[PDB]
Fold this protein.
Amino acid sequence: IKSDKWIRRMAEEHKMIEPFVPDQVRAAEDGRRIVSYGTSSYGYDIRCADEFKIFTNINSTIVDPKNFDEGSFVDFKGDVCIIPPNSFALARTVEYFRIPRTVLTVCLGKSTYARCGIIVNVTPFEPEWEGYVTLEFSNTTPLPAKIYANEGVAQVLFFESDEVCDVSYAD
């Protein structure tokens, strides 16, 4: 696993993460407490942006992962997304990533969300992939649940291999 020193180096020298903060940010401009984001000891706490897609089952009968349909989501833009009970929403990160050929990442939800039964599911970032990261949130509780935009939601952990891969994501 790569360290906070390494993450900093990669952000500043190779634009791995943009926008990037070198430390933990634990409060907003006003001093209001937020779910923290930024560089961590052995990872990076990513933020949720304010554009959400809330799943709706209205007028549908089946979830078909091979036929992803924007029609089964309600667009919501705002500071706090409300996920219906026992259902899910999608969002994207504030951060844009550019992953080196030598790196794979995994991403795990923060305790703030997990402890309330909100499970963030993010798939590994592949070497030479670039993009905003798609976040999914399963609300596994029987009440509506809040997700706070512009604040931390998950921690990305960065692994390097002993061998460069033959075929990267770009190849």
Summary: The chain has one domain: 1-171.
